[PDB]
Design a protein around this nucleic acid. Structure first.
Ligand SMILES: [Mg+2]
Ligand SMILES: [Mg+2]
Ligand SMILES: [Mg+2]
Ligand SMILES: [Mg+2]
Ligand SMILES: [Mg+2]
Ligand SMILES: [Mg+2]
Ligand SMILES: [Mg+2]
Ligand SMILES: [Mg+2]
Ligand SMILES: [Mg+2]
Ligand SMILES: [Mg+2]
Ligand SMILES: [Mg+2]
Ligand SMILES: [Mg+2]
Ligand SMILES: [Mg+2]
Ligand SMILES: [Mg+2]
Ligand SMILES: [Mg+2]
Ligand SMILES: [Mg+2]
Ligand SMILES: [Mg+2]
Ligand SMILES: [Mg+2]
Ligand SMILES: [Mg+2]
Ligand SMILES: [Mg+2]
Ligand SMILES: [Mg+2]
Ligand SMILES: [Mg+2]
Ligand SMILES: [Mg+2]
Ligand SMILES: [Mg+2]
Lengths: 204, 53
RNA sequence: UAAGAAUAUGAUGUUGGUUCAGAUUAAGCGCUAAAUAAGGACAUGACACAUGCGAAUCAUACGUUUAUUAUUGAGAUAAUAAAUAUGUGGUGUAAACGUGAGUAAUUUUAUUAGGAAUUAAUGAACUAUAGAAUAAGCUAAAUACUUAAUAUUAUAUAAAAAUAAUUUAUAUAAUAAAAAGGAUAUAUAUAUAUAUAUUUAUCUAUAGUCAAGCCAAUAAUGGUUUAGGUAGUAGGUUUAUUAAGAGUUAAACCUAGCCAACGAUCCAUAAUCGAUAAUGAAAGUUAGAACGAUCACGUUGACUCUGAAAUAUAGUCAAUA
RNA sequence: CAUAUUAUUAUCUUAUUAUUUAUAUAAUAUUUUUUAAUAAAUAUUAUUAAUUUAUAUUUAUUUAUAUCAGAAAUA
């Protein structure tokens, strides 16, 4: 049959209907007693101009097509070159969209700072109103206005710790007394250990 | 798509029909016989031996 | 189936080179040399060459020339004998032989169980079968030359699949392209023709042999103190030419490529290789004289005819002698 | 500074050959229109041979391109 080679497209788009395919073959170098890879670059015909740099393609022998072209792409084994071009094109629009979005967000935050404390707390506490109550409204309550973010973090942290510790305690207890774990396995439906942990974790 | 002036497939392998190869390479005289002359007899013997071989 | 030795040093160990022991030759030279058998023999000036030979053969292609017999009257024609290739013809010298100048890969070599352009209505010269072998003109005549007669591919329809093409079958189109007679016998008839045959030749077609053309992959010396090279250059699209692909060659249009520090380009050097020779334990290294294989050349260069195939040891022109 | 060989060319010259334009009362064959010497039978009618004419195949003439090889220059 025809000579066939597998290679990487290493240069495309610089010649009309021609690409450069780098192929490698196993040779024995007796001077160093080693199996080596011998590399070569082929000028290869590409009807349709479907290949791109970085594709893994199979080239097949043909009639002479020019002074140096004797092979043609017979099949695209792997098409990373086309994928690279696709992502190149897509990223152009993808990036610019959120680039405009976050610039808008930055400008809005700047304006919020532009049109922009202790005085308000003094007025709310002492007056507890002289046309200032509704003016504050436009911006039990002294506390909820003074609500730092750290408190929510601590509540979430205690929730996380409780969940982990409870899951582990329940798992150890069920693995200890192995009758009730069977009870629970037939209630919910060495693999039994993993399935038991699954049921306990969904349990809470 | 293969190159413009090329053939996509390797040429069609043409298997030998030995009966036809014999029929065309060495066919026997379709005329029944002539059986005259001397050199004609020598040539007939040589031809049949060559064909048989 | 792998052996070392002498020489450093005041002495020692080590490094390190030099040299030696072994085999061999396309060998030369010095001294010496009995017979026989076998294998070889200008490596240098691809320098110049006296002289003689190395490719002729065919008379059953056509023409000439004699002598006897016969008939006819200086000759004519038959039969039988001969001589003739200083006349026209055919076949044979693309081989073999020799040589190694060029050639470092633009066509060279080696290898592959490699390819396609799917290499032509090509046989060169033998087989196996078939069918033909017709007229003039020209030469003195002809199997010499002319002219004329007769004898796969492209379309379209389908079929399939080894399928995105090929193959198959059919129908057309044109294919549409030849030739040759001599030597003997007889048999007719009226020396003349003719009809058969036995011979050896001619042409055409199919297949087989033998063979040719082209391409790919890998490998093939030294110098980068030759580092950049390349504009038909690298690629695309057509046309021309070819049996046939390709910037192969010619023409046009484009694109701006291609090679290169894993060494391009350039320069120098060299015919290449083996189941050949040498050597070594072997890997290898060397040779390429002999045996064989391949290439190139036949005083130097280019071109052309013929031919299937030639820049032919041919022919033309030029150079050298 | 002198001698030699090899290569290259926006240069000059150039055998040969192949293509390439254009020209021939240019030739040899076929086609005409005509002019010449023969034939035969009874004014000829046909043959052979020249004139003019238009298609092929050649030669002469040149146009253009390429080309052995020289010359000049450069390496
Ligand atoms: Mg091309
Ligand atoms: Mg000493
Ligand atoms: Mg020695
Ligand atoms: Mg001898
Ligand atoms: Mg010699
Ligand atoms: Mg020699
Ligand atoms: Mg004779
Ligand atoms: Mg003669
Ligand atoms: Mg020869
Ligand atoms: Mg020889
Ligand atoms: Mg040589
Ligand atoms: Mg005749
Ligand atoms: Mg003849
Ligand atoms: Mg070139
Ligand atoms: Mg071309
Ligand atoms: Mg061109
Ligand atoms: Mg180099
Ligand atoms: Mg040499
Ligand atoms: Mg050598
Ligand atoms: Mg030899
Ligand atoms: Mg020799
Ligand atoms: Mg020669
Ligand atoms: Mg000589
Ligand atoms: Mg020569």
């Amino acid at each position: 049959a025809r000579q066939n080679f597998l290679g990487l497209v290493v240069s495309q788009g610089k010649m009309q209907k021609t690409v450069k395919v780098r192929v490698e073959t196993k040779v024995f170098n007796k001077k160093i007693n080693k199996e080596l890879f011998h590399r070569r670059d082929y000028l290869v015909h590409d009807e349709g101009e479907i290949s791109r740099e970085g594709d893994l393609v199979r080239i097949e022998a043909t009639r002479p097509l020019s002074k140096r072209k004797f092979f043609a792409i017979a099949e695209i084994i792997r098409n990373k070159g086309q994928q690279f071009a696709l992502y190149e094109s897509e990223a152009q629009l993808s990036v610019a969209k959120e680039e405009a979005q976050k610039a808008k967000e930055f400008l809005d935050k700047r304006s919020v700072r532009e049109n922009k404390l202790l005085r308000d707390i003094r007025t709310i506490q002492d007056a507890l109103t002289p046309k200032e109550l509704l003016e504050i409204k436009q911006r039990e309550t002294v506390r909820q206005l003074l609500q730092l973010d750290i408190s929510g973090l601590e509540v979430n942290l205690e929730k996380q710790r409780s969940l982990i510790d409870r899951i582990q305690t329940r798992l150890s207890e069920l693995l200890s007394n192995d009758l009730k774990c069977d009870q629970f396995l037939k209630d919910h439906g060495n693999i039994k250990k993993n399935l038991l942990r699954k049921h306990v974790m969904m349990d809470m | 798509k293969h190159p413009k002036g090329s053939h996509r497939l390797s040429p069609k392998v043409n298997f030998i029909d030995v009966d036809n190869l014999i029929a065309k390479t060495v066919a026997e005289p379709q005329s029944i016989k002539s059986s005259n002359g001397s050199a004609q007899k020598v040539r007939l013997q040589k031809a049949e031996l060559r064909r048989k071989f």
